[PDB]
Amino acid sequence: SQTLRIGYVSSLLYGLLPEIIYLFRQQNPEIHIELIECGTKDQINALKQGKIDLGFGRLKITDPAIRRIVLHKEQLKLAIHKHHHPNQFAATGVHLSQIIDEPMLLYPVSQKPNFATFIQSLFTELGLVPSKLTEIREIQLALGLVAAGEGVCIVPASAMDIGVKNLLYIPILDDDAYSPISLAVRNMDHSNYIPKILACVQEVFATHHIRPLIES
């Protein structure tokens, strides 16, 4: 009769999160899990109100009532159509300064701060201004539009395996070009699903030769 509600952002479906949940379900078959689509910002209130218990997000949205556990620093990639700027965009990587006059697809469409405002700030903190920004509802749609020819899109590396054809995923060479994956929990939540889900995290990361940023 125990129900664990887990908030997640869409891009995490293409990474190791499904494996983490699968392992948790195997180890804890009595626990009913609800996977709930929820942005990192929206997870704050969702956690505070008891509407979710765990929140897997990608922004450093701090709150005294919330504990953030940083799991992994994922590198960012510029998604482009494979015939776009064969010479200007090297497969070895681009700096953000090179793509300022490209129509950029941001995502998702949601309460802010979110991944769109995060990607914007990467340009901003370098003194750069993208020429055109369009916010798209979800990551896979933004990638579909890149392939349809509506520009470029910065995504986490795990998005490389989203099944949209004819894209290249090019390294972003600037130092701040990472998206941290984190688990948010209520600060005074002492339920054992937290240490349990974290052990699943470390096990799955270990399988993939990833060292969690946090030691168990």
- Using the rule CB under 6 A, which residue among 7, 15, 39, 130 binds ligand CCU? 39
Positive/negative CA dihedral, 129, 135, 43, 119: negative
Shortest spacing between CB 154 and ligand CCU, in angstroms:
11
Shortest spacing between CB 179 and a copy of itself, in angstroms:
16
- Using the rule CB under 8 A, which residue among 160, 168, 210, 214 binds a copy of itself? 160
Residue 59 interface partner, choices ligand CCU, a copy of itself, none, CB cut-off 5-8 Å depending on type: ligand CCU
CA 60 to chain centre: 12
User: How far is residue 110's CA from residue 167's CA, in Å, rounded to a whole number?
Assistant: 25
If binding is defined by CB under 6 A, does position 182 make contact with ligand CCU? no
User: How far is residue 214's CA from residue 212's CA, in Å, rounded to a whole number?
Assistant: 5
- Using the rule CB under 6 A, which residue among 5, 6, 10, 99 binds ligand CCU? 10
Interaction residues for ligand CCU, span 52-81 (CB under 6 A): 57-59
Nearest-5° angle of CA 100, CA 101, CA 102? 95
User: How far is residue 185's CA from residue 193's CA, in Å, rounded to a whole number?
Assistant: 11
Interaction residues for a copy of itself, span 112-151 (CB under 8 A): 137, 140-141, 143-145, 147-150
User: How far is residue 162's CA from residue 142's CA, in Å, rounded to a whole number?
Assistant: 11
CA dihedral 133, 138, 144, 150 (to 10 degrees): -10
Residues, the chain, total?
A: 216
| Residue 40 labeled ligand binder | yes
User: How far is residue 25's CA from residue 66's CA, in Å, rounded to a whole number?
Assistant: 25
If binding is defined by CB under 8 A, does position 81 make contact with a copy of itself? yes
- Using the rule CB under 8 A, which residue among 75, 88, 124, 166 binds a copy of itself? 166
If binding is defined by CB under 8 A, does position 21 make contact with a copy of itself? yes
Shortest spacing between CB 140 and a copy of itself, in angstroms:
6
If binding is defined by CB under 6 A, does position 89 make contact with ligand CCU? no
If binding is defined by CB under 8 A, does position 35 make contact with a copy of itself? yes
CA dihedral 159, 163, 164, 167 (to 10 degrees): 60
Nearest-5° angle of CA 175, CA 110, CA 191? 80
Indicate the annotated binding residues for cis,cis-muconate: 11, 40
Positions that interact with ligand CCU (CB under 6 A): 9-11, 39-41, 57-59, 108, 110, 114-115, 139
